[PDB]
Amino acid sequence: PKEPEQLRKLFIGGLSFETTDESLRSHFEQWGTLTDCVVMRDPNTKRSRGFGFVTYATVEEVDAAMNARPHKVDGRVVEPKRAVSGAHLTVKKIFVGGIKEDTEEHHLRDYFEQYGKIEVIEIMTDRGSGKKRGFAFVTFDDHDSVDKIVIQKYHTVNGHNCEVRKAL
């Protein structure tokens, strides 16, 4: 059973205009089997549009590629991002709801630290009473953590089924 193709794709921005399907593939095949690899080009001039995409055989291979950033492809540092879940909302912060009053910082840290490096955990409290409001924000050092988090169907933290969204 293969993972949905959308979850196996990486949009690669910032390409050198000299990058080709072949050189993009030769680069990204270091981290997994590529089922597709395309440089976007103008339909008339064939000049590169400066971005492209690669599709790996598995999600674990996407993770491997993202963990190997920064990627310097044909002399230029590129910007890989997972496919949208059609514009990417590139953020480093999530809202975590449904955590009730008994969820503490270590619950959120022990879970979310496996998605990425955490910089801030903010457990929301009531401005008047100080009581926990049942939601939190987690800020990571990089957007890929958030991208991995929000495409999961479920998040279980401190026994609670949590609702997690990108936060601006």
Ligand X SMILES: CC(C)N1CCN(C(=O)c2cccs2)CC1
Which residues are at the interface with ligand X (CB under 6 A)? 11, 59-60, 63, 81, 83-84, 86-88
Q: How far is the CB of 38 from ligand X (least distance, A)?
A: 11
* Beta carbon of residue 86, minimum distance to ligand X (angstroms, whole number): 5
Cβ proximity to ligand X, 86 vs 159, nearer residue: 86
Nearest to 86, CA basis, from 155, 15, 6: 6
Q: Identify the DSSP state of 164.
A: E
Q: Is 32 exposed, middle or buried (0-12, 13-18, 19+ CB in 10 A)?
A: buried
- Closest to ligand X by CB, 1 or 130: 1
146 contacts 140 by C-beta, under 8 angstroms: yes
* Residue 60: CB minimum distance to ligand X, A: 4
Q: Which is nearer to ligand X, 36 or 60 (CB)?
A: 60
- Please state, in angstroms and rounded to a whole number, the distance separating the CA atoms of residues 135 and 150: 16
**Nearest distance in Å: CB 9, ligand X:** 8
